[PDB]
Subunit: 385 residues, 4 copies
């Protein structure tokens, strides 16, 4: 099979909750379940047809055995369904989709779901096993420890972004200008109904969560006045960096033959996927390497892409990527992104792909690129049908 036989037939996501707010105490498995139910309904695919699942999740500590399996069974899929979780840090939700695409292209399965999820609100604290040392010891926060602190440099991802910003002269002012644009684009897209197709609501004990929570949590006048968040002479702030958040996003994928068999409407097809990596501290420049890689795989050029989703881990990252590759900013993150919508780590790679699946006009091509802790980036190109 060619890669273009791989089609997306549904996509859905939860709203993104703010840290310890809308989805406080809601396990990641609930978020995943509801996004997966939503995606299957979007695809008009009964859960019993799903043969295999790949779900990204980065810090599932204390969510119980096999949270990916919990999501799949919770959504009503048969116990015969094959399930795997993946962790490629911030790229997890994209890499899950790639893994699903690979087994479809090899005809190992016909109907597969994939996506990503994270509940950062529910990440626990750790106490190591064994004798608690005389004099006491630290209760470790799983979010920096397993999620956001770079191991090799022992600095937070935002401090790494400061390093990249300084190296490439991406100024505080440029980062804040971009951050404001993201917040404004998020609000405009919500007002215009842009997310209506992809969003499914959740009831939380009772209120209904149906809208991204983060993008209203902003004061434009204060943005240029904020102190650096990560290093004393830094440029990255809480406003121009992504936030801690909760959410899940899922897609339903099959082959052109599977879609015909079940009377399904293909929404998009795969053109290319892949990954690149560089030094851990420089994860922010890795999208600029994965993008030419997946363009070459797709036999495309930069001008052939109608929309870019370059995950906004920090304003630094799309700014670097756009200027280094010569991208048109009016075609990049046009409905906002993680600086204003938030970054549930395992979710975001799946969210941005599912967004392209729904928001591209038929015939248009979209490229998603997402940097990840450790120095990597995932990339993916799709064609809307």
């Amino acid at each position: 099979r060619p890669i273009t036989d791989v089609v997306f037939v549904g996509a859905a996501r939860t709203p993104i909750g703010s840290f310890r707010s809308a989805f406080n105490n809601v396990p990641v498995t609930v978020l995943g379940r509801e996004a997966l139910k939503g995606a299957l309904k979007n695809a008009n695919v009964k859960p019993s047809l799903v043969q295999e699942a790949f779900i990204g999740v980065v810090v599932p500590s204390n969510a119980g055995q096999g949270p990916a399996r919990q999501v799949v069974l919770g959504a009503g899929c048969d116990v015969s369904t094959v399930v795997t979780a993946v962790n490629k840090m911030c790229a997890s939700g994209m890499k899950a989709i790639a893994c699903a695409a690979s087994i479809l292209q090899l005809d190992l399965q016909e109907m597969v779901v994939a996506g990503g999820m994270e509940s950062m609100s529910c990440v626990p604290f750790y106490l190591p096993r064994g004798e608690i040392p005389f004099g006491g010891t630290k209760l470790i926060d799983g979010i920096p420890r397993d999620g956001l602190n770079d191991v090799y440099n022992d600095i937070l991802m935002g401090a790494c972004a400061d390093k990249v910003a300084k190296q490439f002269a991406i100024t505080r002012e440029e980062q804040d200008k971009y951050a404001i644009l993201s917040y404004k684009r998020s609000a405009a897209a919500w007002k215009e109904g842009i997310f209506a197709k992809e969003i499914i609501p959740l009831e939380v004990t009772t209120i209904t969560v149906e809208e991204d929570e983060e993008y209203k949590k902003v004061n434009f006048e204060k943005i240029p006045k904020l102190k650096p968040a990560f290093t004393s002479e830094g440029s990255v702030t809480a406003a121009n960096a992504s936030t801690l958040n909760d959410g899940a996003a899922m897609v339903v994928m099959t082959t052109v033959d599977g879609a015909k068999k079940h009377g399904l409407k293909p929404l998009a097809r795969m053109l290319a996927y892949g990954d690149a990596a560089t030094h851990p501290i420089d994860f922010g420049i890795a999208p600029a390497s994965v993008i030419p890689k997946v363009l070459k795989l797709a036999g495309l050029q930069i001008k052939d892409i109608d929309l870019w989703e370059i995950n906004e881990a920090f304003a630094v990252v799309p700014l670097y990527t756009m200027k280094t590759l010569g991208l048109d900013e009016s075609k990049v993150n046009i409905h906002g992104g993680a600086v204003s919508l938030g970054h549930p780590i395992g979710m975001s790679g799946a969210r941005i792909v599912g967004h392209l699946v729904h928001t591209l006009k038929p015939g248009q091509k979209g490229c998603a690129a997402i940097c990840n802790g450790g120095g990597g980036a995932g990339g993916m190109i799709i064609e809307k049908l």
Copy 2:
């Protein structure tokens, strides 16, 4: 490419340490690093040739950001290396190998490493985020919580095995006879040098660990006298169940063309891989379903397999599998298995595949099948060259 173009060029593993013993306080990333260095040396592949890695690990809590990436960089691979972790519970180390094989068959990479790892000794305890409730709360053990307790039934995997045993009249006495056979087969294999090819030693603080620790921790006379370990009227005991353990196993994989390009000797080729699943409590019968699936994928019958590695999660599992499929016990787990060697959850699926890579005679075919928490099983068939 056909699947048979995928070849194994190296395999290695750490010894398996016993719980809080040989590798006490040794992080999983150290074990994985040493297994990967060993596998690359076994393959005569310099680390800079590795393009991508998939590593299984089930409970990496508090091992820091991206433990799979830590292993790959620790082993001397280039920062350009693409890395992903996978969690399919007990099948993780096998599923990692399958994911590597898929991208090789699609010619998305040429040189890939895969494996699995676990440090159960270093799994922490958890405290949830937010208000500690008045009256106190439980510090949660990550091992049962994220590793070995079935979430749907809220019973341990050993209690699930009790259920399967009673349903299919697999007696205490049969389980104990099988357990004793496993311990004896492990000891004999160690004496006969069977593991010399696959084992790499580790220095720990300063002792050298060069031999599996678990298989000596047994008293045959006491085995029939042990009390049930999981349920009051149960048949599963500490002796006839797998144990908590630490270890890592890795393989190096390429295509027939890659091997030619780099002057490498293929050790084995892929014939088939896949997965099956059933009700979570019945994971013990899932290998009996995946085995016919992968045999069909390879165009083979039971008689065509020379050696079986059916992971010994509990003696129940190989016993069920052998009697249901009509397997010859003299061809099953002939060098011991997880009842006597231990079960570092993320490691075992990679261990048993790497063991077949080294221990099969040229021209022989081996099938590995590994049940996993949640109801699944992974299967794989390879041919020795």
Copy 3:
């Protein structure tokens, strides 16, 4: 010296804060310090004249070394000051005053301070020393563990009160009638300025706390509708039981000769003090035994007492005491008590004595009696001067 040579020359207290409210995160040592500063100012005694201190405190876990010493030095007393803490559970603040009286009567010191304090809001959770058990363990709440759970019966003090109530036919309706009367008496006393002399304010980061917090936290209409708080068929509820609270109360004591020497005005003199005890579960009836004991020591009869302070651990306790001894309810707890003002365990015994010191008319006699966990009660009689 006769006991009547022992005189009180000052008394003060903090307001009583509600649990995790006004004095949340304010250590017990701050509360103690401010009450002691206040008492010394009330007595017109410069801190440098204080020779010795006894301070009651029941659960000072994590308040640091020698919280009583911290209070005394914090209040400006000389480092030459002798300091001891006492724990007689709920009687601690009274027993401290008794110990001070004893050394004054023996002429071992001339100027002594005494009182009691508790920050229940700041009581920590406990994790035992050593190996955290496989499978996890409970984080223990210090409030029930060291404060309010009876060790011998392994039931809460309120459950003990249920037992006593049932035994002596003290009904739910009688308890609620008494509780309402306490809440109304507390509000009336506050309105009438009754506490103005004894109260000192605290600034907390900034707001000024100057009024007891608990007595407004009531709904009279709901009181008869509440469910039992401690046992399924019980009579004790949250409304007719004392609450968890924060506060400190201190007195300054000397001899008649010391008062003359320093030009001080005696506010009251000691007539008797002592203790009684019975079975732990029956602590509620112990005040009825200590009262005749201290009357006999003072050579007095019940009719000679103008005001009674019978600590309101539960409405059960003053109800039992009044009916069994034939006390006039119009002379008992006339300005409210712990059911409506709260029960910071180590404080209350000192609070009720200091209240009598200020509120008795000159020449009147007051008797304070306070039951304590373990089965005890303290008693004290004073004469206003």
Copy 4:
């Protein structure tokens, strides 16, 4: 009554266990119970005669409600017994005895027990109430926090002793010579049966503990080679400092009339007791102030004392005291002390007084002086009968 009417009729103690060794996991209440049963047997006083108890204990966190009451009821005393715990840090066990003596001299009771206890092995760790902060927090060790860290200087008691040592030219070599002498004196006293009268054995899970554990844990050749334990340029070491330990010591006290009434033999009588204090960091010089105070109270001079027990918190303390007061070293701590026997904080002040009760010859006078965290010291003088 004169103070000399107060008599000791019995004394006993547990052996002192080493940290997490002989009495590991044995609660302080068990140690206190056995010491109290032993003291009552030594006195030939049936438990039902005991009217009141004062028991020292410094860090009873997680030992449950009213550990002093638990000890008294555990020893078989009647529920009518009045019980109080006291905390004067290291002086607690002595101050308890003083409080008992005061109420006997005032004829408020006739038969009273007093002592001190500590299980440092069972001291827990603390987690504060309320929100665990983002990023984690420290699990606090109760031993330094509530027992051995000076709050004002935020340094350990051993570092305070370094300061006193340097100020007064008490050298490392002098401290080590004194330490060695203590270890040798402890061993010799054990061999000569000196402790046979005061010791009572305990059964622990099943071994019998009948001898002090600490004084054998020494290597004389290594003592001059140890590194400073508290400050980089310090003189105090693990060997010449007291250790962490578990134990309890109790006495039985009455009046001359009480002894006659019950047919008891007075062992010793009280001559004086009291306390002094100075700056917290200088607790090591406080015994040199309390000793002249209690000598004056007794109408005695230094030459009138036959044996001194100056608690060996650090070798610094008896060295300072002896050279400042001109004491004969051959009359000081002649059977060892806390440097070699250990320092269960709440116990030691009672241990050294009970030791004088048994080891003084009839007609001899003994003075005990014990420094305490916070800057204090307790003193006591008794006369053997």
